[PDB]
């Protein structure tokens, strides 16, 4: 039961009418707790998890100011980046960054992250040591030199060991029922005759939390890695997740196939067959 507070930030230099110049969504593990954005310089904030109703008004008023200041700073940085990469005005460009901290069961800090991308590609990453940076090119190497000359990671560590920990601790307490849980998958195999006369076996997993899961089909003396159709894990919209993996198999050979489900809420993997 390790836990993370994560924020996913996006700044857009020339967004469409009505679209955000700046947006960030905050999560604890796989549960979203808020939306912040700035549209035409107007900041807005919305709660997204029930425990956020326990926050004092001062939380939202400090947050509003953070949104305004972050949105302007990100816009300024998009302007500088356009210049250093000698790109054209009039085009829209994207600056993204992820901020997180992670604690263990005893609430001990285990790690933290700060990483940024420009136009969908890695730009700069803070290393595991929380003191040095990794760049990808000569523009981001300038950034690294600035941040290291300035000691800027000191102020990021002060954020990690200050407000990131504060909020992670408070949210895990106020949202304990939602957050300190693992819901195991409920799984079954569905059976679908095909026109050609063979069969689809679709192994389903529903109702699980958190999202991380593995579904695997195995025959017996055969590996089915390249035969499986696997959908990307997907939200049910009620806080749980679902997934399936399918294989096409000969009619009358269904009992040779086994679906295995691995999830942190299970004590041992489920092994499932088409029961019939």
């Amino acid at each position: 039961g390790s836990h993370s507070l994560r924020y996913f930030h996006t700044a857009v230099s020339r967004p469409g009418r009505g679209e955000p110049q700046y947006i960030s969504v905050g999560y604890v593990d796989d549960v979203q707790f808020q939306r912040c954005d700035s549209i035409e310089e107007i900041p807005r904030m919305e709660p997204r998890a029930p425990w956020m109703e326990k926050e004092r008004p001062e939380y939202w008023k400090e947050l509003k100011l953070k949104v305004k200041n972050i949105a302007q700073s990100a816009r300024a940085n998009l302007r500088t980046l356009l210049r250093y990469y000698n790109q054209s005005e009039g085009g829209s460009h994207i600056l993204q960054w992820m901020v997180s901290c992670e604690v263990g069961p005893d609430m001990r800090l285990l790690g933290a992250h700060y990483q940024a991308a420009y136009d969908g590609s890695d730009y700069i990453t803070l290393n595991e040591d929380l003191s040095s940076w990794t760049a990808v090119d000569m523009v981001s190497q300038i950034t690294k030199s600035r941040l290291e000359s300035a000691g800027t990671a000191e102020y990021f560590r002060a954020y990690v060991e200050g407000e990131c920990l504060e909020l992670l601790h408070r949210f895990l307490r106020n949202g304990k029922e939602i957050l300190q849980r693992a819901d195991p998958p409920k799984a079954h195999v569905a059976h679908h005759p095909r026109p050609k006369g063979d069969v689809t076996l679709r192994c389903w997993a529903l109702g699980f939390y958190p999202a991380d899961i593995t579904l695997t089909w195995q025959k017996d003396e055969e590996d089915l890695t390249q035969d499986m159709e696997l959908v990307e894990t997907r939200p049910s919209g009620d806080g749980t997740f679902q997934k399936w993996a399918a294989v096409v198999v000969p009619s009358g050979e269904e009992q040779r196939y086994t679906c295995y489900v691995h999830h942190e809420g299970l004590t041992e993997p489920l092994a499932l067959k088409w029961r019939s």
């Binding site: 924020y7 930030h9 960030s24 905050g26 912040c36 947050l63 953070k66 949104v67 200041n69 972050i70 700073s73 990100a74 300024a76 940085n77 500088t80 980046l81 250093y84 960054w97 901020v99 700060y114 940024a116 730009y123 700069i124 523009v139 981001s140 300038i142 950034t143 600035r146 941040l147 800027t152 990021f156 954020y159 407000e163």
Partner: peptide, 7 residues
């Protein structure tokens, strides 16, 4: 809710 100037 933290931001570093990259340039």
């Amino acid at each position: 809710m933290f931001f570093i100037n990259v340039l």
